[PDB]
Design a protein around this ligand. Structure first.
Ligand SMILES: Cc1ccccc1-c1n[nH]c(=S)n1N
Ligand SMILES: Cc1ccccc1-c1n[nH]c(=S)n1N
Ligand SMILES: Cc1ccccc1-c1n[nH]c(=S)n1N
Ligand SMILES: Cc1ccccc1-c1n[nH]c(=S)n1N
Ligand SMILES: Cc1ccccc1-c1n[nH]c(=S)n1N
Ligand SMILES: Cc1ccccc1-c1n[nH]c(=S)n1N
Ligand SMILES: Cc1ccccc1-c1n[nH]c(=S)n1N
Ligand SMILES: Cc1ccccc1-c1n[nH]c(=S)n1N
Ligand SMILES: [Zn+2]
Ligand SMILES: [Zn+2]
Ligand SMILES: [Zn+2]
Ligand SMILES: [Zn+2]
Ligand SMILES: [Zn+2]
Ligand SMILES: [Zn+2]
Ligand SMILES: [Zn+2]
Ligand SMILES: [Zn+2]
Lengths: 266, 266, 266, 266
């Protein structure tokens, strides 16, 4: 007799789980996640902002890197997200319990986060994580300000309905640097055409390619560094090979077109 | 010495609160709300669907009209919404407690409904109602089926971010009738330009005019009958003067353009 | 023809809405609410705690009093509640939006707060307010610490299922002062016996009288000052006539017994 | 270099996941879960009630057994729970999506269910499952009626704060059978004494032993059949060796006392 299968945890490449010390991107902005998952710490005179947390098991590591940067749990004011999947919003619930952080997200990301990634449009309950509540809902183009640093939401629906690019201007060498943190434009295993759970998926991705193309973008960062050709293990050269937002959008669209063609052929 | 003001309940025109008997729109579809607030009952071989409930005090009236139509509380399967303001989603929480009904809504409508209309983009906490949870989140263009009757969501963001037109095909006289239930395209007291809580408000309304224009639309109904020139008190002539979806969209756009011009002048 | 009634806002005595300047209770502890609604500010080296906010319209007043005390919105860390009715938790949602404050509450209070007081066991939807989410759920006897000040939850179910007394030790004149903030032990218009929504109501109130009787209680404060014979308008004599926790419990039990007898007679 | 550990799914004994055909307990009441996880189907003239669903992967199996019993997804009206851990409430979110079922639970169980078992008092995020919302909150002693069958909640806090025994009277052989579905009285790996997350844990378990002892209890069933000495694989003898509620309470208290002694020694 054959029992129902055991639950299976989603495993990821070791590099996604490999702790790294803080890597400075600009005067206020640091990568504090792992070798292969972005978690951006933005430090202001009025507390700190975290953009993404990576996987659920990264909470303690994030807190240790924050401490190394001089940010105590009380000092973390705000959490923003690229998208509410387990490998980017994984530790958000735990971070909220263990810090002063509140979450701002769009309605789509808030709904997905509140169900801990369950009933995903494409993944079903395959990739779940601890649910968290949003403290503020943002609209497309809306800004949120912490310690005078202004972050602008740019909705880029597709990878998830609530996928968002976040933009802000930091400084380096006395010069402004317009940083764009663009969400994933992957569609891993997705049914793209005629998907009853996402009927306008293709139109949304197309619009999102155009949105990403047009971001204020002196420097592009992505939830997976490899997407934008960052190499967080490469020290002084970490960002040397980084794509422009234009090239990232184009490469993602080319890949998407290929996937659409293969799906039609499939 | 001057105390803080007493809370003020939102009052509405008496007609919005004036009970009426069920008014048949098509073979399966009945208006069961008040003279001036739409609440559509769609009766299927597998239970009933309610589109909108009107104001919070209308729950019992709705249930009485459902009973008159042969729909017991157990038989009400689904609640859909035009938008999650007090004068359309008012009694939803109570209906869920008192019937078998589950709610399907988009993420924006779900978020607003779950906070009972509080922290509204334009109204603040001026117009609140009992919060309710959504049971199913729908995407733009997604269909939901009850007793073989298929309802399609058409997102028409503006009046609220989650404003939705619902379409379905009923029958009359052996002929199909493509019914369009289009949400409000009003912007009552709204700041339209440069609204920090809704930066792309104008672009969303413009897109929504185009969406409404293009709906499958043999018969248009609206949350306020007057918006589409229905007169639910007019018996056999209730729907005679009804606007097409095209004319409704055009009139709403003309009004919107006027409001934009007056705002610029203001 | 007779329309459904207009919604009616709950009105309260003017004194409940009458702003007052901060009134010091102990070295760290201030009354910052109105003449007749308690809102306790506890100021620590690590940010401030608010116990209750009063009615929904009191948010701005609370924030102004906090500013007068040197507590900026960022500095408000924690909100605790006596019970989640409109006249004590009214402004909590707004305070969370406008400050750094997170909410800790028991599961019963959290559920009631999340529905904005709707579907109340006794009031139905008569007394609703903007819903808010809890950030931390506490158990009976659990402590929560802010800036070294330790607050202990004592569950005293009855007035609401989640009614809580909060205790902490402050100082005055170099001496410890064990402060007890005991919730209401009223049952206004309640059906006490055989209430299908609260079958063990009487047993819970009885247990709660015993809990209140036994609190560490050098100084008793209550959500309505009059309950404990505080007079916040009386300056240096505000707390002179204050009841012990023992006397408060006894008077409340005597009143309850009377109500039970009258209900039996009714 | 050493990456953070991969997430680990909780595995269970194969028997907990071993599908079985429906096993009749009384005229209306069937075991439809697995060999070693209880899921009780109660069939009424007005739809069906499910008490527990077992593990997250059991949804489809439950639905298949319901179909075999003549209960279509539309016909499932109500889900009740012993406690909101993954091995009993696992499939509840999915069941709600796939059926007409609404959930009734106490505030503690509702809060835990809504966070999908995350931030557990004892397990932390070790044992999570898809979150679900409750549709009705019940108080201790409150009854809920479906198709004339009356279910009474008896709170028995300890295993979880919201642990509940459910009682109802079915029939067998023309005679009433008072069925008691008592929750777990285990404390697996729990810190019992001086637990900051559950300060009154011991007092709650003691009270719960007394509650279980005193249930109306012609037949005891438990979430794990072995707890009450049921053997669902034993056909006509499945319930022969079943403990009384009195013996179950006593054995659980004896085990608890042993655990307390070992903890003190530890
Ligand atoms: C596809 C996948 C498998 C396991 C864990 C996470 C994911 C995932 N969701 N979104 C992105 S980007 N992923 N890598
Ligand atoms: C005060 C509080 C309640 C719930 C969750 C988190 C917190 C909190 N605020 N600041 C810090 S550090 N916390 N842990
Ligand atoms: C503007 C207003 C006042 C009171 C009650 C409801 C409303 C309202 N919100 N959306 C629409 S359409 N309304 N009439
Ligand atoms: C069973 C149930 C639980 C919570 C809320 C509503 C209901 C319900 N289902 N069918 C009917 S009629 N109900 N009242
Ligand atoms: C009874 C009542 C009427 C209006 C507003 C609030 C209340 C109330 N709930 N709990 C307490 S204490 N109140 N005064
Ligand atoms: C950052 C944030 C997000 C949502 C709600 C409130 C807040 C906040 N934290 N500190 C202050 S002051 N806020 N307004
Ligand atoms: C202890 C444990 C491990 C894995 C899955 C479930 C559980 C559990 N929680 N409550 C009960 S009873 N369990 N068996
Ligand atoms: C209508 C509905 C919406 C959300 C979730 C479930 C359902 C539902 N009701 N009856 C059946 S069968 N459903 N799947
Ligand atoms: Zn993803
Ligand atoms: Zn990813
Ligand atoms: Zn509206
Ligand atoms: Zn309206
Ligand atoms: Zn009250
Ligand atoms: Zn009060
Ligand atoms: Zn358990
Ligand atoms: Zn178990």
């Amino acid at each position: 007799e054959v029992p129902l299968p055991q639950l299976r945890a989603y495993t990821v490449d070791a590099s996604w789980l490999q702790p790294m010390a803080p890597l400075q991107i600009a005067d206020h902005t640091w990568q504090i996640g792992t070798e292969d998952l972005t978690a951006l710490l933005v430090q202001t005179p009025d507390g700190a902002v975290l953009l993404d947390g990576g996987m659920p098991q990264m909470a303690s590591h994030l807190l240790d890197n924050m401490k190394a940067r001089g940010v105590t749990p009380r000092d973390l004011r705000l959490i923003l997200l690229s998208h509410a999947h387990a490998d980017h919003a994984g530790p958000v619930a735990e971070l909220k319990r263990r810090t002063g952080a509140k979450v701002a997200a769009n309605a789509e990301s808030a709904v997905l986060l509140a169900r801990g990634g369950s009933d995903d449009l494409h993944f079903g309950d395959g990739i779940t994580y601890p649910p968290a509540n949003a403290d503020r809902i943002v609209m497309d183009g809306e800004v949120i300000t912490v310690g005078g640093i202004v972050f602008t939401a740019h909705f880029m629906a597709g990878h998830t309905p609530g996928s968002t690019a976040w933009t802000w201007t930091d400084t380096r060498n006395g010069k402004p640097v317009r940083i764009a943190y663009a969400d994933s434009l992957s569609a891993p295993g997705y049914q793209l055409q005629g998907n009853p759970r996402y009927p306008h998926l293709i139109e949304d991705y197309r619009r999102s390619f155009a949105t990403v193309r047009a971001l204020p973008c002196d420097v592009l960062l992505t939830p997976h560094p490899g997407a934008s050709n960052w190499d967080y293990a490469a020290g002084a050269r970490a960002g040397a090979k980084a794509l422009t937002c234009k090239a990232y959008a184009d490469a993602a669209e080319q890949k998407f077109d290929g996937q659409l063609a293969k799906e039609t052929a499939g």
